[PDB]
Amino acid sequence: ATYAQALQSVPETQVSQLDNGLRVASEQSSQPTCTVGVWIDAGSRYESEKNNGAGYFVEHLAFKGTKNRPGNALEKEVESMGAHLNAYSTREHTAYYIKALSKDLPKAVELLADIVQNCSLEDSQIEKERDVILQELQENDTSMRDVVFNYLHATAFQGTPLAQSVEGPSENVRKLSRADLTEYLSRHYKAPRMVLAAAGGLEHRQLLDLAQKHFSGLSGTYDEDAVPTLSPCRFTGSQICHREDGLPLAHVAIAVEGPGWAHPDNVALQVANAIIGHYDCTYGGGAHLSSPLASIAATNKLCQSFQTFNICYADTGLLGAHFVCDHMSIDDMMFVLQGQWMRLCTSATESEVLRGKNLLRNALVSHLDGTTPVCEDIGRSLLTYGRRIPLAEWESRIAEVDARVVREVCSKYFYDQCPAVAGFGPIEQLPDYNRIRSGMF
């Protein structure tokens, strides 16, 4: 078949909803294994300065025992059936998911229901996790990449909830109480804020009945005065430079404000980012890479690596790049990078945009490879778009992009716009903000 007919053969994702508001979505395949999980509209963007880190603390407690399965009982059950239980928290979403044999879907759904509704939160466990989290904060401090990205959010979204890290400040970790957590939970873990998603060898009808059976008790009301809604987050052209000449390589992240999840412009932006691409010293292409930034960097040894990114949030986002380089290569790297954004705004060619479109097509499909990536796409999509966008639609959106669309969309977000800049390490050579700003036009 052609790439076109193959697109129309992907089973359509089935979506249902319970009385309490919980959405149930699934994509059936014939895999003897599956992934099922709960995606929640909860994250640090929903936290205030007082409880920032609450969600991450809960993630630490989620698998430590439930009222029905105290202590390591939940753990033993997951392990004995050979399943895998994982979780993650971001500034807007939280997810708990299980990879298991398709025949074990009923127990998998029960366990998730149990986890999301009956978490013990034993005072002694809370004290133990407190120390674990503090140690994780210390470890994260050694990850220059994680530090620079937290810094980018701190400065770009300064004064708003998006400026907050997911883990929260250490003093919050030392002071968060069970009361704080149960409070956070009663407020955010409601059925209308959750999506039960599954992908693999199972039928929607079976998942739906299991959901009715195990999630019906989940609250779908809350009230009116306590319905955590999101306010837009102001973006600020600014710079944060943490100079540390003791570190061997400098990390720099720069971005302009992105449009947010729902905007159609994200497709063209993804095409443009694909044109500039990514790179690191282990890439075999070197001097022949198609991206001018990549080949210049490789032939002139300008950096160890770089990556463009389009981080999306509800109504805003960070569109830009991150690079790692020697202290004497920062200005050159910034010069070439900004020159490439400007070239795309004013002179993107049909041939490079086609390449970008093909890169995006390949990335889209190769990403949805396996029950876990698919299940995550279902969960997240339902939370963000309110629907699963089919591949055939993505193709239509990508197809609509041409050189004209790329120049116009890039001009809209990059041209003469104030960026947010974060630097960490031996950054004496990181350009002054005025010089960076002038580089935007």
Binding site: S238, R243, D331
Partner: protein, 73 residues
């Protein structure tokens, strides 16, 4: 001399705002004047005296010159 080879600096964080996000003349007068007064009071004792001396020597010398050329000083 080039950025990247100047000197060694560790543990310093610098925060800045784009010029477009801020005022070019924040509190120009409500603060500008008070600081100018501070800076003025702060140096006048070092700067002014010598010139007051010049002024005196000048007026005395000029008047002395005048008187000296007259019939009855």
């Amino acid at each position: 001399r080039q950025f990247g080879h100047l000197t060694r600096v560790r543990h310093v964080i610098t925060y800045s705002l784009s010029p477009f996000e801020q005022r070019a003349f924040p509190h120009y007068f409500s603060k500008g004047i008070p600081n100018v007064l501070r800076r003025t009071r702060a140096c006048i004792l070092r700067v002014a005296p010598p010139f007051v001396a010049f002024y005196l020597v000048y007026t005395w010398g000029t008047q002395e010159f005048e008187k000296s050329k007259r019939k009855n000083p």
